[PDB]
Amino acid sequence: GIDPFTMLRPRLCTMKKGPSGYGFNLHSDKSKPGQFIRSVDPDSPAEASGLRAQDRIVEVNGVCMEGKQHGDVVSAIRAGGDETKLLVVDRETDEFFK
């Protein structure tokens, strides 16, 4: 029942704004699922940390709220100062199960 390594486990990401920012994108529609990543810049703060597009946003700077609103998720990133602690999910598997 339980996976040895992991299947969908949540991933932790730590990107530093600075003069580069994040280098990623975010897209959302419904108000039930939440906010997911639409694009990621290769070799960018998001990548350097270990982030990959398609991942589902779970928290922002410690605030773990599954189902946050676009403005809520966007604002969370703004209030994250220079260090944005983002916890996302792996859709790579989400598509696998498809």
CATH number at residue 69: 2.30.42.10
Return the number of other C-beta atoms located less than 10 Å from residue 76's C-beta: 20
Looking at this protein, which amino acid is placed at residue 50?
A: G
Q: Number of structural domains, the chain?
A: 1
**In the PDB record, what is the listed experimental method?**
NMR
Q: Which residue has the tokens 């944005």?
A: 84
Sign of CA dihedral 27, 25, 21, 10: positive
Q: Is 81 exposed, middle or buried (0-12, 13-18, 19+ CB in 10 A)?
A: exposed
Domain residues for 20?
Answer: 1-98
